[PDB]
Amino acid sequence: RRFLNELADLYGVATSYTDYKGAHIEVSDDTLVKILRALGVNLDTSNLPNDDAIQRQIALFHDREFTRPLPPSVVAVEGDELVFPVHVHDGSPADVHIELEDGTQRDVSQVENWTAPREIDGIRWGEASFKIPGDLPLGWHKLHLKSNERSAECGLIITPARLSTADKYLDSPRSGVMAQIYSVRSTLSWGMGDFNDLGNLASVVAQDGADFLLINPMHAAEPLPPTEDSPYLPTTRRFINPIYIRVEDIPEFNQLEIDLRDDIAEMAAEFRERNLTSDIIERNDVYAAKLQVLRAIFEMPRSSEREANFVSFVQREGQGLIDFATWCADRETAQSESVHGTEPDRDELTMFYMWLQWLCDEQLAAAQKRAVDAGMSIGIMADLAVGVHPGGADAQNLSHVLAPDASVGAPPDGYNQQGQDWSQPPWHPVRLAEEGYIPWRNLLRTVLRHSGGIRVDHVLGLFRLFVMPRMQSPATGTYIRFDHNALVGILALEAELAGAVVIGEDLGTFEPWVQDALAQRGIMGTSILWFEHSPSQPGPRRQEEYRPLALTTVTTHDLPPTAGYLEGEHIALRERLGVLNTDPAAELAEDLQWQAEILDVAASANALPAREYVGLERDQRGELAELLEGLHTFVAKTPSALTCVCLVDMVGEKRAQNQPGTTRDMYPNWCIPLCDSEGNSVLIESLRENELYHRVAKASKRD
């Protein structure tokens, strides 16, 4: 075990941990070996390696480190004169320079290095140290090494000390609205919300003071139905789901012949009827129908201004676009049924999937423009899922920077007794760095392109991930470490270049250095009223104890909306799905007590009248609107830089969008259309007609 621990340490594989229920776990030998092998360490396939083979992997690690001409990459915060190692054949030149992102050359300076040379596979190697200048601009640079006829390069990435939005909003606190956009319909939506709806909704809530509209992840899933309902298991984290395209807004739509336009209107009219119902959302027939229309509009010729815009987009997005689109073409061809002696044209199909991304780009840009022209300081705030579907586009195209024999999840919980497996393949911590973090850069830059902020799901994943050998129980997992200076630094860099807010979903209870690494960069936490406990006294967090560098909400997409939550729906819902194991009554009683305590704290802050809630019957605490107003006021007057009103709470929705740890045959997660307390659909057009909307909007105002 001593040699296995030594090896695990060199690869950043944890040999023990504390679980989410606070238990101490020593990781098995078997798990260490399987995770090392998932990272590409050559240990015997029996998962029965001997001490020789482990010792030989130790020595190979040190030797391979000693023959790296440059580091995999070098990441530094602005102002740091960071020192890095170079390895050359002993007695040959170590000529090193910097090429900045803009093409400018810079120099490095040699500094003292005491390391002795070593012979490795018959070559004597030496080590030198060089120091970067402390005045490099932010961005994506390169280090270049020439040693006679040998050459090497690595990324040199310079990251900001602090996001400018952090002090802006600390100084000038604002509110916003969160919406699950697929669930919010206008009169014209095809059964589910689209990019037009996104921009429309932003413009509407902006009239009542909202400075951002936070939405679900919008990452692409399967390129044709059937398609994943969860926004949190997409096929890529870079490219965008074309299901959201409003086809009628495409300029070339208008070049279709009128009889085809009438056919399309007939399809449209049928999906539009769904907008008026409370029926579960069906992505598959909507998607299939849009794709059919998009295939027709793709034939229409573009004006030369439009063509040059499309070509400009394709140039900008580079090879990852072509790779994603080619993967879509391949998936389509494999699932479709070929006529005898006809082949689909892979290149034309590739072009079609490229073009769908260009449409997503321009419709999202127009949505953001609408939001900001309506007065929003931030605009759309995007959400970044933790990871991708294991058999999908990124799993293939980014294979070289993943460890697909491991699966991402969560260790065992008080609630989830066997932990969780989210099924995603993790980044490979070294190979991602060898690639200069360019895949992390590119997904971020796309996510932030038309947004004013990003919410990072599972932000702890910038530091470490809990992983298990694929197809094994989460009890068998362990943590793999990442270079947080790189992952967090690059998140801050991309956000700073985009003038963006960064929110890191903060829910767990991690080491002080981790919290500090985020806070120092101006990355905001997340405070959720129903989960918050006072650091100081027992019971709920007081108004004045809410963290300033945070997004504070009453609720989230993983909880029942507040009208349901007030009436015990979290418990009624878990019970009817058979996912509560404890006694329903004892749970409802615990819930009433906790609610009472929160309502008492709200009353100490003058947000509600001081009724002395502990003791009151559930239906004796005030009208729903009064309680909504009081909770929203309580949140609005916290010192939190940002607060978020959930759209569901503005219309009296009682149905949960997602019940965590239920599956799609248990509850229609991610399929619940926006409805009021009476189960009636609320369209975007009607939002501001209902008095409840205006009451909650006024209660949430911050100035």
UniProtKB/TrEMBL annotation:
Swiss-Prot/TrEMBL catalytic activity: Transfers a segment of a (1->4)-alpha-D-glucan to a new position in an acceptor, which may be glucose or a (1->4)-alpha-D-glucan
InterPro entries (UniProt xref): GH (IPR017853), Glyco_hydro_77 (IPR003385), MalQ_N (IPR048458)
GO biological process, one term: carbohydrate metabolic process
Keywords: Carbohydrate metabolism, Glycosyltransferase, Transferase
SUPFAM superfamilies xref list: (Trans)glycosidases
Gene Ontology terms for molecular function: 4-alpha-glucanotransferase activity
EC identifiers of the protein: 2.4.1.25
Pfam families with a match to the protein in the record: Glyco_hydro_77 (PF02446), MalQ_N (PF21226)
Domain MalQ N-terminal beta-sandwich residue range list: 70-160
Protein origin, superkingdom: Bacteria
Family label: Belongs to the disproportionating enzyme family.
Protein name (database record): 4-alpha-glucanotransferase
Organism whose genome encodes this protein: Corynebacterium glutamicum (Brevibacterium saccharolyticum)
